[PDB]
Motif scaffolding. Structure first.
Motif, mmCIF file in Angstrom:
data_model
loop_
_atom_site.group_PDB
_atom_site.id
_atom_site.type_symbol
_atom_site.label_atom_id
_atom_site.label_comp_id
_atom_site.label_asym_id
_atom_site.label_seq_id
_atom_site.Cartn_x
_atom_site.Cartn_y
_atom_site.Cartn_z
ATOM 1 N N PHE A 432 84.836 58.727 21.515
ATOM 2 C CA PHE A 432 84.313 60.010 21.032
ATOM 3 C C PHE A 432 84.851 60.390 19.646
ATOM 4 C CE2 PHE A 432 84.338 64.828 21.405
ATOM 5 C CZ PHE A 432 82.994 64.959 21.120
ATOM 6 N N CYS A 433 83.937 60.762 18.758
ATOM 7 C CA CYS A 433 84.286 61.049 17.375
ATOM 8 C C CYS A 433 85.048 62.372 17.250
ATOM 9 C CB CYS A 433 83.026 61.060 16.499
ATOM 10 S SG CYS A 433 81.902 62.458 16.776
ATOM 11 N N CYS A 438 78.609 66.897 17.807
ATOM 12 C CA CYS A 438 78.337 65.739 18.642
ATOM 13 C C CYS A 438 78.534 66.094 20.104
ATOM 14 C CB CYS A 438 79.244 64.569 18.254
ATOM 15 S SG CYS A 438 78.915 63.105 19.240
ATOM 16 N N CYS A 473 81.614 56.039 18.407
ATOM 17 C CA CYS A 473 81.334 57.109 19.344
ATOM 18 C C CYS A 473 79.948 56.894 19.921
ATOM 19 C CB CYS A 473 81.380 58.453 18.635
ATOM 20 S SG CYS A 473 80.595 59.737 19.571
ATOM 21 N N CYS A 475 77.436 58.539 19.875
ATOM 22 C CA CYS A 475 76.355 59.186 19.138
ATOM 23 C C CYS A 475 75.775 58.217 18.106
ATOM 24 C CB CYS A 475 76.850 60.458 18.443
ATOM 25 S SG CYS A 475 78.168 60.180 17.202
#
Ligand SMILES: Nc1ncnc2c1ncn2[C@@H]1O[C@H](CO)[C@@H](O)[C@H]1O
Ligand SMILES: Nc1ncnc2c1ncn2[C@@H]1O[C@H](CO)[C@@H](O)[C@H]1O
Ligand code: PRO
Ligand code: PRO
Ligand SMILES: [Zn+2]
Ligand SMILES: [Zn+2]
Lengths: 490, 490
Positions: A432-433, A438, A473, A475
């Motif tokens: 996860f960024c 996001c 990530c 996304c």
């Protein structure tokens, strides 16, 4: 017990908490009566926690429930988040008063002005106060006993330090207590982590948290939080002091706040409860051992009815002697079979059966509430055997819930796999960024693919997998900062 | 301490409760912060009381703060009395809600509907519940910390019995506990009696009470109440059951309710406080013995500064061993003379002085906070001597306040003598016809002759004088029913 945990969980829950006599519904929505069987668990939790923070230098106190609108607002970020859920007192009798006063939803803005008054030197820090009290957060979302209520009981600790290292250290000590409460007392396993930027406490720099998993509804839940408020409140409230060794320049205190609530008892019920009713970890039950005279063939003997009672009380007195919270249920208005069921619904760890046939052999029957396993025990080994079973029950409950966690929290590296795993009824550690955008996306997205959307739970202090250098990530856009725990949630 | 108890008592009180660190003022009127030194006394009181009611079969629980207007009113007499002081929640955020909900001023009408739900058989009685919580009673009369506050902490017990003898017996047991709390713990003497018809609890048949005397302001005050509610609430709330041995006919439960509050700590302060500050009965102080290194001639030795600290801690550890709540004040930022004064303002029973000169003689100095008397004690007799002094302090405080009571409560048989005695700054046992009218009269009358009017305190269970057959109430009109205690009051 009517409903089944696996079918109508909301029906199962509403029955287990009432038929175990823990809860009673009020005529005001999202407000619930804690009957003694429930309130005793809290008192056990309170007894543990209280002795621990005491050891860290915290002292108990009590601040007013009411907070004035001026004080409430002094930290604009904080008050923003809580403002709509705050209930307002407007009239006394018919007299509308000269102001609307607020009921505390939390106590930062009640306590902190007084912290300013109290801090005048570097000598006056640290300040460590805790209070056990009720707060109110008025949310109209459909409420659930313990888990999501409009009024609830909790503790809140608020500390203030000269330095930041001190404050830092307290945050993690408290979160370890909270972890103990869940794991040592309630036999529930938790994941310690840091809340994301989206999720963290309104005001203050970081929020650490422990998260537990309710496998039945597939969701996770937050058990307790430990915040580092930094100087955010310090600067809004003037909590200041002169650093002696850096004179002339004014300093702001570093501040922590932390809280645990009666939702503990709800998490306890959801994790450990049976189709046969509640089940209580020995460390917290009002009564650990219930003694029951049984096998009484109605109309048989009165000299024997007396020898039986005498035996029940011999046991009680011996168990009391070795600090076992024991109750002998000697009532003659109710059947043995009725008593068996009553205390099972209430979750008493061990039922102790005394019957004439068994007395004859100078012996009795112990019955474990978790497994339902019966053990015939010699009368002279009663203390040592019942100790050992109780603590075995504590262990069994925790390991069952442990293994349940371990197979419902798994790593998933791509938004494809993360959506299928999340829909099997689990929680997932994704790369996860860390971005607020996001995160808002994953929520909407996971509610579209396959009836709510996953949230950040925490960023695990000790994550499942080591995040690899080339890692994106879920996304696609940014690379991944850290494995972050996500799932559907209360 | 600036003011003198004998001059500006309100100034003296406001200083003693702040400079002893018990209280802190809030930005909302008649609302007060209980700092730990105060909250610890309550916790001591709570620890005592709680273990006692537990022995009588009472269990703790927690009911909601909010009460709906429908439920509030069900007992018209009760709600009449409390209606104007009740605060009302009106809006959540901006959302005015679909009803005004009430904050409990007391909990009869929160708990009693649920009592109805819970009582379905004669088997379900008795029901004995207690809760420790806050209530709110919004009175704009000028408030005083502990004594008269808009929010306060208390316990309330509410019991329900099949018969009336049972209920009767509980009322008097509870009032004896309350008497113990005042006399055994706070070293305050009280008079047990029955409230008059004018004064009794709104709803219910009789109110018993304990009254204490604050000689400084010449007034008396009510310390705790134990009410017999009879069937008054039982019939408004449908708390009913079938008597088994008188079938077909429905029965109403007999009900008691009883309460004690943080005003205890105010009564404690007013009775025992000095021109030198607070004074704490050993049975309730956060700390009983404070150890102070003194006689330190600034810049002398560092090996000796170390031997001194070591001695202070030898004492602490030995006192801890014999359950004396001891604190060693080892802080180097503050003078010995400053520490002496600090803990005196806070009322610590015994100050324990350790100096080098005294250490040399293998010995120390114990200083009693009540008398100021110094005793040099051998180091090896430290536990036994400090035990004995503490308990002597408990005794001394109580006997001083006893003799103070005995000479400020006297019998006066005529309205002439009753008015002169009442104006000397006392409380009086008069012959009294018992009538509400006559009572309203004495109030107006005594405020005219010689700046408030006397009230009924109670009708002493064990009055000063035996009321003689030919005896007239002090109104002339009716004869006297019973010697009744009257005086000016908080
Ligand atoms: N609705 C609730 N009922 C009980 N506890 C709650 C509720 N909502 C939040 N909490 C607790 O609030 C604390 C911080 O907001 C968390 O520990 C969380 O457990
Ligand atoms: N203003 C107050 N502050 C604290 N206790 C109070 C106050 N007013 C009444 N009480 C207590 O209320 C109880 C019953 O009303 C009594 O025991 C009395 O001591
Ligand atoms: O609400 C919270 O999370 C913190 C805990 C203590 C008070 N405020
Ligand atoms: O106010 C009173 O006097 C009683 C005490 C318990 C609750 N109501
Ligand atoms: Zn992302
Ligand atoms: Zn009269």
């Amino acid at each position: 017990l009517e409903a089944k945990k696996e079918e109508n969980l909301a029906d199962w829950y509403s029955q287990v908490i009432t038929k175990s006599e823990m809860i009673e519904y009020h005529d005001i929505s999202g407000c619930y009566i804690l009957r003694p069987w429930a309130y005793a668990i809290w008192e056990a939790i309170k007894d543990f926690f209280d002795a621990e923070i005491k050891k860290l230098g915290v002292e108990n106190c009590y601040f007013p429930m009411f907070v004035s609108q001026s004080a409430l607002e002094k930290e604009k970020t904080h008050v923003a988040d809580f403002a709509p859920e705050v209930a307002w007192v407007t009239r006394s009798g018919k007299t509308e008063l000269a102001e609307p006063i607020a009921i505390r939803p939390t106590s930062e803005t009640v306590m902190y002005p007084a912290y300013a008054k109290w801090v005048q030197s570097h000598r006056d820090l640290p300040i460590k106060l805790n209070q056990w009290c009720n707060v109110v957060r008025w949310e109209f979302k459909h409420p659930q006993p313990f888990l999501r209520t409009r009024e609830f009981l909790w503790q809140e600790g608020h500390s203030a330090f000269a330095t930041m290292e001190e404050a830092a250290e307290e945050v993690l000590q408290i979160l370890d207590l909270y972890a103990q409460v869940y794991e040592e007392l309630l036999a529930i396993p938790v994941v310690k982590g840091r809340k994301t930027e989206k999720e963290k406490f309104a005001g203050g720099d970081y929020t650490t948290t422990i998260e537990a998993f309710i496998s039945a509804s597939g969701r996770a839940i937050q058990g307790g939080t430990s915040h580092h408020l930094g100087q955010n409140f310090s600067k809004m409230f003037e909590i200041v002091f002169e650093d002696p060794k850096i004179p002339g320049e004014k300093q702001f205190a570093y501040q922590n706040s932390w809280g645990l609530t009666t939702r503990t008892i709800g998490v306890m019920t959801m994790v450990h409860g049976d189709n046969m009713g509640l089940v209580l970890p020995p460390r917290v039950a009002c009564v650990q051992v219930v003694i029951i005279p049984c096998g009484i063939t109605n109309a048989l003997s009165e000299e024997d009815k007396e020898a039986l009672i005498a035996k029940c009380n011999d046991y009680r007195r011996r168990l009391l002697s070795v600090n076992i919270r024991v109750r002998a249920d000697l009532r003659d208005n109710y059947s043995p079979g009725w008593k068996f069921n009553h205390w099972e619904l209430k979750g008493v760890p061990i039922r102790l059966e005394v019957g004439p046939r068994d007395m004859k052999s100078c012996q009795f029957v112990a019955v474990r509430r978790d497994t339902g396993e019966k053990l015939t025990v010699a009368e002279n080994e009663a203390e040592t055997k019942l100790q050992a079973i109780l603590e075995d029950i504590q262990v069994t409950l925790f390991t069952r819930a442990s293994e349940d966690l371990k197979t419902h929290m798994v790593v998933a590296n791509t938004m494809e796999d993360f959506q299928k795993i999340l829909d099997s009824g689990k929680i997932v550690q994704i790369p996860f960024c860390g971005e607020i955008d996001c995160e808002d996306w994953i929520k909407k997205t996971t509610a579209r693919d396959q009836s709510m959307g996953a949230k950040s739970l925490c960023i695990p202090f000790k994550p499942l997998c080591e995040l690899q250098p080339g890692a994106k990530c879920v996304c696609g856009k940014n690379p991944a900062k850290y494995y972050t725990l996500f799932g559907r949630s209360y």
